[PDB]
RNA sequence: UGAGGUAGUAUU
């Protein structure tokens, strides 16, 4: 795509904030100012795994030196791209015919010159900043520096993993944790940077399929009371093993991919087998394995794996199959597996810092023969960078004392403070979906008493007892009760729903409440009803007040950016994709006052895995319209925070979405052209920042302080990007959010935009804490997540779209809080 | 589902 909208240059660096010395997991890379030669490699067959492509090229490099490669050490991306330090002695296009040994594998390979890539030009961009960074030069460098690791380890995205050795972290259900590292090369001022971080992801364990089945179905002993799998067990087992690769053990080692699991057991599952007589008969898998391999199945009552093409009949008894090693788990982990993995992978900032250092020392990048071939040198120590801790905004509260809150280390509380605009709760009801013996009437009364007191101190007075309180069982009971409530109790403001933990009832409560009836609901776990704490109750009130149209607090007005001198709307946008049928979900929220405090939400479904927000123009138009309704002001500026996108698609996302925002404005009025600031906020990266002075480490996790900002040294050489760690680190190693200013009509300075971004992280209503991303971005995530619950069903795109449309009386509410 | 933070989140 011809990039029409060029990203704005960095207008300057920030000067505001207390200086803090930091170390970054970015290591300086020195490159020679030379030409690098780019060749295209065409392999047939062309749909082999990258691993196989690498084996093919490695064979060629070793067997074709006097002809082609000489003493050069080429680097290869496992696909189309090969690089060498000097030109290959070829005119144009050489075709090869090789027999790589395992059955024998024959490949047809052709190689031709594609381009000359200049690393001098790359250097000149990094030092001057008067030319665009040559991406083709960066790619060549990236391929050279990860070539060896790609041969040694198992690549996963931009990371590398290897089988566990000296450690073992089973997750259950046939999954385990592999440790490894991320590696990427990134342009910075003066020099390229090698970004290295430790990493850990889920892999399927290399074990017999039988044992894999027993973990998935939670079977302690396959030999205790042996019996066929129930229909539920089969489907459950099938969903886990379908798509996975298995290997057989009855032939001394062929691999297959599982396409299905037979309903019939091995004793009865048949297939057409041609005998020596020429006659074809329906032979069972058990009979076949007995006659062919003299194998007596120990578990003929168990199903078979169907492998290869579904159209044909290749069945494998479970007991002759192993799960193939090295298969990454793309499927979602259970709540239990998630907890176990987080536990085994949690690393404090000082510990991660040491692991990265240790990795770099042991890696010996300067002893990599391919790195040496290309005359590349890597600095041993982490890049030093002086960050700045931005000042936190003061928050204004209400009540008769009108207290202010001053954040300390990214945190404040409501002690002695009342909501800026607190709602009085006259009419409210309680629906208890936890059983009576689990949540007695006496427990209910104590909960509501403690809640009414906390709410009174917070300036959200709950008058009297609930108008209605009753027990109920099952999600089927939600709609009848809710409809009854809406029709019986006039002026009903809130339903408090007590839940027995994880239950389908929650999704139904939100469906009926948000989309069907348009009624405010607040769910609470029964454990938090039985054991009440002022802190939990206080946090509950934060959500309730906002859901009922209140304002918890505001930024002190005179300590904000000058953009507030004119009507300005803040947008947050997010896209969530379905786990590894279901659609992708897009969400855009928009501020509805000048604080900015209250937000309205829009949400859509679209094609699975599509990153671009397809309906953005319509969504923005709705928000602009609602903004005008609420404020009677036409926004002169639009500040758009877009939650993370893959950087490989970033120029495409900006192009179409910036057009869509502009499109929305013009369709409202022909000459309506408000100033647009488009900011991408990213958490899914591997940039790590550590306190250089170990005494400045905060808490047990020992992370950098909230407000720590970096816009030098490791950032883009001329574009407008910065890291801001807005949150207190209380768990593992903090991820500083990365902000990329892709467009700015509004002439923001670095300080102004960095501070504005920080302040927005203090406007998030769910907690009195500075959060890791601006509230509009966070709100957008919550809206998309809520839509997923709305989509829960107990088909066609049109029905899916209707399922996420909230009720009329919900459209102008913060139901997502 | 009080809340934030965080590992990960493409032959038979």
Coordinates of N, CA, C and O in Angstrom, one line a residue, chain A residues 554-647:
Chain A
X554 N -12.9 13.7 39.4 CA -12.4 14.3 38.1 C -10.9 14.7 38.3 O -10.5 14.9 39.4
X555 N -10.2 14.9 37.2 CA -8.9 15.5 37.2 C -9.1 16.9 37.6 O -10.1 17.6 37.2
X556 N -8.3 17.5 38.5 CA -8.3 18.9 38.8 C -8.1 19.6 37.5 O -7.1 19.5 36.8
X557 N -9.1 20.4 37.1 CA -9.3 21.0 35.8 C -8.1 21.9 35.3 O -7.7 21.8 34.2
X558 N -7.6 22.7 36.2 CA -6.5 23.7 35.8 C -5.1 23.1 35.7 O -4.2 23.8 35.3
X559 N -5.0 21.8 35.9 CA -3.8 21.1 35.8 C -3.8 20.1 34.6 O -3.3 19.0 34.7
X560 N -4.4 20.5 33.5 CA -4.6 19.6 32.4 C -4.0 20.3 31.1 O -3.6 21.5 31.1
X561 N -3.9 19.5 30.0 CA -3.4 20.0 28.7 C -4.3 21.2 28.2 O -5.5 21.2 28.6
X562 N -3.8 22.0 27.4 CA -4.5 23.2 26.8 C -5.6 22.7 25.8 O -6.4 23.6 25.4
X563 N -5.6 21.5 25.4 CA -6.6 21.0 24.5 C -8.0 21.0 25.1 O -9.0 21.0 24.4
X564 N -8.1 21.1 26.4 CA -9.4 21.2 27.1 C -10.0 22.6 27.0 O -11.1 22.8 27.5
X565 N -9.2 23.5 26.5 CA -9.8 24.9 26.3 C -10.8 24.9 25.2 O -11.5 25.9 25.0
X566 N -10.8 23.9 24.4 CA -11.8 23.7 23.4 C -12.5 22.3 23.6 O -11.9 21.5 24.2
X567 N -13.7 22.1 23.0 CA -14.4 20.8 23.1 C -13.5 19.7 22.5 O -13.1 19.8 21.3
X568 N -13.2 18.7 23.3 CA -12.3 17.6 22.8 C -13.0 16.3 23.2 O -13.5 16.1 24.3
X569 N -13.0 15.3 22.3 CA -13.4 14.0 22.6 C -12.3 13.0 22.6 O -11.4 13.0 21.7
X570 N -12.3 12.1 23.6 CA -11.3 11.0 23.7 C -11.9 9.7 23.3 O -12.9 9.3 23.9
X571 N -11.3 9.0 22.4 CA -11.7 7.7 21.9 C -10.8 6.6 22.3 O -9.6 6.8 22.3
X572 N -11.3 5.5 22.7 CA -10.5 4.3 22.9 C -11.1 3.2 22.1 O -12.3 3.0 21.9
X573 N -10.2 2.4 21.4 CA -10.6 1.4 20.5 C -9.8 0.1 20.7 O -8.6 0.1 21.0
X574 N -10.5 -1.1 20.6 CA -9.9 -2.4 20.8 C -10.5 -3.4 19.9 O -11.7 -3.3 19.5
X575 N -9.8 -4.4 19.6 CA -10.3 -5.5 18.8 C -9.9 -6.8 19.5 O -8.7 -7.0 19.8
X576 N -10.8 -7.7 19.7 CA -10.6 -9.0 20.3 C -10.9 -10.1 19.4 O -12.0 -10.1 18.8
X577 N -10.0 -11.1 19.2 CA -10.2 -12.2 18.3 C -10.6 -13.4 19.0 O -10.2 -13.6 20.2
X578 N -11.4 -14.3 18.4 CA -11.8 -15.5 19.0 C -10.6 -16.5 19.3 O -9.7 -16.5 18.6
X579 N -10.7 -17.3 20.4 CA -9.7 -18.2 20.7 C -9.5 -19.3 19.7 O -10.4 -19.5 18.8
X580 N -8.4 -20.0 19.7 CA -8.1 -21.0 18.7 C -9.0 -22.2 18.9 O -9.7 -22.7 17.9
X581 N -15.6 -20.1 13.6 CA -16.9 -20.1 14.1 C -17.3 -18.7 14.7 O -18.0 -17.9 14.1
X582 N -16.6 -18.4 15.8 CA -16.9 -17.1 16.5 C -16.3 -15.9 15.8 O -15.2 -16.0 15.2
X583 N -17.0 -14.8 15.9 CA -16.5 -13.6 15.2 C -15.4 -12.8 16.0 O -15.2 -13.1 17.2
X584 N -14.8 -11.9 15.4 CA -13.9 -10.9 16.1 C -14.9 -9.8 16.6 O -15.9 -9.6 16.0
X585 N -14.4 -9.1 17.7 CA -15.2 -8.1 18.2 C -14.5 -6.8 18.2 O -13.3 -6.7 18.6
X586 N -15.2 -5.7 17.8 CA -14.6 -4.4 17.8 C -15.3 -3.5 18.8 O -16.6 -3.6 18.9
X587 N -14.6 -2.6 19.5 CA -15.2 -1.8 20.5 C -14.6 -0.4 20.4 O -13.3 -0.3 20.4
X588 N -15.4 0.6 20.4 CA -14.9 2.0 20.4 C -15.7 2.8 21.5 O -17.0 2.8 21.4
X589 N -15.1 3.4 22.4 CA -15.7 4.2 23.4 C -15.4 5.7 23.2 O -14.4 6.0 22.6
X590 N -16.2 6.6 23.7 CA -16.0 8.0 23.6 C -16.4 8.8 24.8 O -17.4 8.5 25.4
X591 N -15.5 9.7 25.2 CA -15.8 10.6 26.3 C -17.1 11.4 26.1 O -17.4 11.7 24.9
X592 N -17.8 11.7 27.1 CA -19.1 12.4 27.0 C -19.2 13.7 27.8 O -20.3 14.2 28.0
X593 N -18.0 14.1 28.4 CA -18.0 15.4 29.1 C -16.6 15.9 29.0 O -15.7 15.3 28.3
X594 N -16.3 17.1 29.6 CA -15.0 17.7 29.5 C -14.0 17.4 30.6 O -13.0 18.0 30.7
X595 N -14.4 16.4 31.4 CA -13.6 16.1 32.6 C -12.2 15.5 32.3 O -11.2 16.0 32.9
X596 N -12.1 14.5 31.5 CA -13.1 13.6 30.9 C -13.4 12.4 31.9 O -12.5 11.8 32.4
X597 N -14.7 12.2 32.1 CA -15.0 11.1 33.1 C -16.0 10.1 32.5 O -15.6 8.9 32.5
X598 N -17.1 10.5 32.1 CA -18.1 9.5 31.5 C -17.8 9.1 30.1 O -17.5 10.0 29.3
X599 N -18.1 7.9 29.7 CA -17.9 7.4 28.4 C -19.1 6.6 27.9 O -19.8 6.0 28.7
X600 N -19.4 6.7 26.6 CA -20.4 5.8 26.0 C -19.6 4.8 25.0 O -18.6 5.1 24.5
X601 N -20.3 3.7 24.8 CA -19.6 2.6 24.1 C -20.4 2.2 22.8 O -21.6 2.3 22.7
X602 N -19.6 1.8 21.8 CA -20.1 1.2 20.6 C -19.4 -0.1 20.5 O -18.2 -0.3 20.8
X603 N -20.0 -1.1 19.9 CA -19.5 -2.4 19.7 C -20.0 -3.1 18.5 O -21.2 -3.0 18.2
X604 N -19.2 -3.9 17.8 CA -19.6 -4.6 16.6 C -18.9 -6.0 16.5 O -17.9 -6.2 17.2
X605 N -19.5 -6.9 15.7 CA -18.9 -8.1 15.3 C -18.4 -8.0 13.9 O -18.9 -7.2 13.2
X606 N -17.3 -8.7 13.6 CA -16.8 -8.7 12.2 C -16.1 -10.0 11.9 O -16.0 -10.9 12.8
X607 N -15.6 -10.1 10.7 CA -14.8 -11.3 10.2 C -13.8 -11.7 11.2 O -13.0 -10.9 11.7
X608 N -13.7 -13.0 11.6 CA -12.7 -13.5 12.5 C -11.3 -13.2 12.1 O -10.9 -13.3 10.9
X609 N -10.5 -12.7 13.1 CA -9.1 -12.4 12.9 C -8.8 -11.1 12.1 O -7.6 -10.9 11.8
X610 N -9.8 -10.4 11.7 CA -9.6 -9.1 11.0 C -9.2 -8.1 12.0 O -9.8 -7.9 13.0
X611 N -8.1 -7.4 11.7 CA -7.5 -6.4 12.7 C -8.1 -5.0 12.5 O -8.4 -4.3 13.5
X612 N -8.3 -4.6 11.3 CA -8.9 -3.3 11.0 C -10.4 -3.3 11.5 O -11.1 -4.2 11.3
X613 N -10.7 -2.2 12.2 CA -12.1 -2.0 12.7 C -12.9 -1.6 11.5 O -13.0 -0.4 11.1
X614 N -13.6 -2.6 10.9 CA -14.4 -2.4 9.7 C -15.5 -1.3 9.8 O -15.6 -0.5 8.8
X615 N -16.2 -1.2 10.9 CA -17.3 -0.3 11.0 C -16.9 1.0 11.8 O -17.8 1.6 12.4
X616 N -15.7 1.4 11.7 CA -15.2 2.5 12.5 C -15.9 3.8 12.2 O -16.2 4.5 13.2
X617 N -16.1 4.1 11.0 CA -16.8 5.3 10.6 C -18.1 5.5 11.2 O -18.4 6.5 11.8
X618 N -19.0 4.5 11.1 CA -20.3 4.4 11.8 C -20.1 4.6 13.3 O -20.8 5.4 13.9
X619 N -19.2 3.8 13.9 CA -19.0 3.8 15.3 C -18.6 5.2 15.8 O -19.2 5.7 16.8
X620 N -17.7 5.9 15.1 CA -17.2 7.2 15.5 C -18.4 8.2 15.3 O -18.5 9.1 16.2
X621 N -19.1 8.1 14.3 CA -20.2 9.0 14.0 C -21.2 8.9 15.2 O -21.7 10.0 15.6
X622 N -21.5 7.7 15.6 CA -22.4 7.6 16.8 C -21.9 8.3 18.0 O -22.7 8.9 18.7
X623 N -20.6 8.2 18.3 CA -20.0 8.8 19.4 C -20.0 10.3 19.4 O -20.2 11.0 20.3
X624 N -19.7 10.8 18.2 CA -19.7 12.2 17.9 C -21.1 12.8 18.2 O -21.2 13.8 18.8
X625 N -22.1 12.1 17.6 CA -23.5 12.5 17.8 C -23.9 12.5 19.3 O -24.5 13.5 19.7
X626 N -23.5 11.5 20.0 CA -23.8 11.4 21.4 C -23.1 12.5 22.2 O -23.6 13.0 23.2
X627 N -21.8 12.7 21.8 CA -21.1 13.8 22.5 C -21.8 15.1 22.4 O -21.8 15.9 23.3
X628 N -22.3 15.4 21.2 CA -23.0 16.7 21.0 C -24.3 16.7 21.8 O -24.7 17.7 22.3
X629 N -25.0 15.6 21.9 CA -26.2 15.5 22.6 C -25.9 15.8 24.1 O -26.7 16.5 24.8
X630 N -24.8 15.3 24.6 CA -24.5 15.4 26.0 C -23.9 16.7 26.4 O -24.2 17.2 27.5
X631 N -23.1 17.3 25.5 CA -22.4 18.6 25.8 C -22.9 19.8 25.1 O -22.6 20.9 25.4
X632 N -23.7 19.6 24.0 CA -24.1 20.6 23.1 C -22.9 21.3 22.4 O -22.9 22.4 21.9
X633 N -21.8 20.5 22.3 CA -20.6 21.0 21.7 C -20.1 20.0 20.6 O -20.2 18.8 20.7
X634 N -19.7 20.6 19.5 CA -19.0 19.9 18.4 C -17.5 19.8 18.8 O -16.9 20.9 19.0
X635 N -17.0 18.6 18.9 CA -15.5 18.4 19.2 C -14.7 19.1 18.1 O -14.9 18.8 16.9
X636 N -13.7 19.9 18.5 CA -12.8 20.5 17.6 C -11.5 19.6 17.5 O -10.7 19.7 16.5
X637 N -11.4 18.7 18.4 CA -10.2 17.8 18.4 C -10.7 16.3 18.8 O -11.6 16.2 19.6
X638 N -10.1 15.4 18.2 CA -10.3 14.0 18.5 C -9.0 13.3 18.9 O -8.1 13.2 18.1
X639 N -8.9 12.8 20.1 CA -7.8 12.0 20.6 C -8.1 10.6 20.6 O -8.8 10.1 21.5
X640 N -7.4 9.8 19.8 CA -7.8 8.4 19.5 C -6.7 7.4 20.0 O -5.6 7.3 19.4
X641 N -7.0 6.7 21.1 CA -6.1 5.7 21.6 C -6.5 4.3 21.1 O -7.6 3.9 21.4
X642 N -5.6 3.7 20.3 CA -5.9 2.4 19.7 C -5.1 1.3 20.4 O -3.9 1.3 20.4
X643 N -5.8 0.3 20.9 CA -5.2 -0.7 21.6 C -4.4 -1.7 20.7 O -4.8 -1.9 19.5
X644 N -3.3 -2.2 21.1 CA -2.3 -2.9 20.3 C -2.7 -3.6 19.1 O -3.7 -4.3 19.0
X645 N -1.9 -3.4 18.0 CA -2.0 -4.2 16.8 C -0.6 -4.7 16.5 O 0.4 -4.2 16.9
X646 N -0.5 -5.8 15.7 CA 0.8 -6.3 15.3 C 1.5 -5.3 14.4 O 0.8 -4.7 13.6
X647 N 2.7 -5.0 14.7 CA 3.5 -4.0 14.0 C 3.6 -4.2 12.5 O 3.8 -3.3 11.7

